[PDB]
Amino acid sequence: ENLYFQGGIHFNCLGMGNRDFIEGASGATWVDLVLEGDSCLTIMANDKPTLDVRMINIEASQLAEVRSYCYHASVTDISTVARCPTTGEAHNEKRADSSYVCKQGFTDRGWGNGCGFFGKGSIDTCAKFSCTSKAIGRTIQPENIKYKVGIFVHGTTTSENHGNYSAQVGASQAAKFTVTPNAPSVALKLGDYGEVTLDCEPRSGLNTEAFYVMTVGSKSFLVHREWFHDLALPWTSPSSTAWRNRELLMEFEGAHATKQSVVALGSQEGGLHHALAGAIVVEYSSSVMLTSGHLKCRLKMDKLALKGTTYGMCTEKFSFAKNPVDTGHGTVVIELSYSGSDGPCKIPIVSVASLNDMTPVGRLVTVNPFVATSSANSKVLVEMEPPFGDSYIVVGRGDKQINHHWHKAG
């Protein structure tokens, strides 16, 4: 696919409002995760590159109609047949046309309006019903659900490309894969970092017998099933193609002598949206429905390796392309510019408590940061967790070395 000319996706964590950090046991082969749809996980493990994993969305396909409800009807071609008192029931011939809704009644008759006898004359009034606009309720089967999950390895990035999916796939540093009930475990390679396996239990986060997907006009919703069954609207189903309870959208008004008007209610769409005010909204424009939720998984990392743990250290001078800023997640991010051209090469960077005391404090989130190109003045983003209080970010070695002060409150 041409990702370079497709829309971006949220596939990693920096900049997102909701972010959780996960620390995997040192040496452990697996880490247990719950992907929540509005959030993002950063996974850090000793001797492992750092990962972002996040659910992108949940898709359902091939949904089956259960019932359709008319919410806006047209009512046309009204007629009334009437009879005199004592002559029995009126029968309008449109009773033979399944498209018509008919109702019997009575009107006052006498000499004055054409009857030899005084009393109640039978009338029968029919009108053609058609559905102008209908809402549709559908079921999802679990086999037709797909979870799209993004993964990102904290390799070399820049402030410009860090969140760009086509750039990180280009760098072999991101990927997007699909777990389903029938295929709930997936292995993918991550460039020079080996592979991971996502071993998930999709069925545990599914409740497809609890709801219907209901489309109303331009919106679709997840609705409680019994609420859907008791809607007071005309309906059809696959096993019952003709509209039943069509009178619900019709008003047979007061009859006089031999005439009676029948009108349609206005659209019931707005009433429906009102009733659905607090219901889950889902995207259901195409044949595919998109929603969000939870997915429990185990992330396997025994085949996940460090990359370039054998490059040489960068030898030339760095500078701060962007001075450190708090990410809002308890971490600090910088962007470095590297003047050298021996790249790719490892960035010497540490937090120390003072320049007297060059003892490493804190730690990197972008573990093993590296310049990835021989181009001079390239950029590398580095995310880190300094300690509380005063420390200095120290980049490079010797007298090439630069530092920036930082203070973390608390």
Author numbering: -9 to 400
Lines quoted from the article behind this entry:
Studies have demonstrated that E protein is the most important protein determing the virulence of JEV. To address this open question we determined the X-ray structures of the E protein ectodomains of JEV SA14-14-2 and of its parent virulent SA14 virus in a monomeric state and reliably modeled dimers (assembled to 180-mers) and trimers mostly present during the viral life cycle. The structures of JEV SA14 and SA14-14-2 E protein are highly similar to those of other flaviviruses. Architecturally, all of them consist of three domains, Domain I (DI, yellow), Domain II (DII, red) and Domain III (DIII, dark blue).
The JEV SA14-14-2 in our study is used for the JE live attenuated vaccine production in China. The overall crystal structures of JEV SA14 and SA14-14-2 E proteins were determined at a resolution of 2.2 Å and 2.1 Å, respectively, by molecular replacement methods. The rotation angle between JEV SA14 and SA14-14-2 DII relative to the superimposed DIII was 12.5° resulting in a distance between the two Gly102 (b and c) of 21.9 Å. Notably, JEV SA14-14-2 Met279 superimposes with JEV SA14 Val280 which implicates a shortcut of segment 280–283 and a prolongation of the preceding β hairpin 274–279. Met279 contacts Ala50, Ile130, Val203, Val272 and Tyr274 and thus becomes part of a hydrophobic patch which is larger than that in JEV SA14 E protein ectodomain. While Glu138Lys change is the key event to shift Glu49 to Lys138 in JEV SA14-14-2 E protein and thus induce the inversion of the side chain direction of residue 279 from the bulk solvent to the hydrophobic protein interior accompanied by a rotation of the preceding β hairpin 274–279 towards DIII which pulls the entire DII with it. Although the fusion loops of the determined JEV SA14 and SA14-14-2 E protein are structurally similar, the Leu107Phe change slightly modifies the surface profile and the hydrophobicity. We speculated the aromatic side chain of Phe107 in JE attenuated virus SA14-14-2 E protein might cause some steric hindrance, such that the invasion of Trp101 of JE attenuated virus SA14-14-2 E protein into the membrane is hampered compared to JE virulent virus SA14 thereby causing virulence attenuation. The lower fusion activity of JE attenuated virus SA14-14-2 is compatible with its unfavorable trimer geometry and its reduced dimer dissociation capability because of the fixation of the DII to DI + DIII angle in JEV SA14-14-2 monomers due to the mutation of residues 107, 138 and 279.
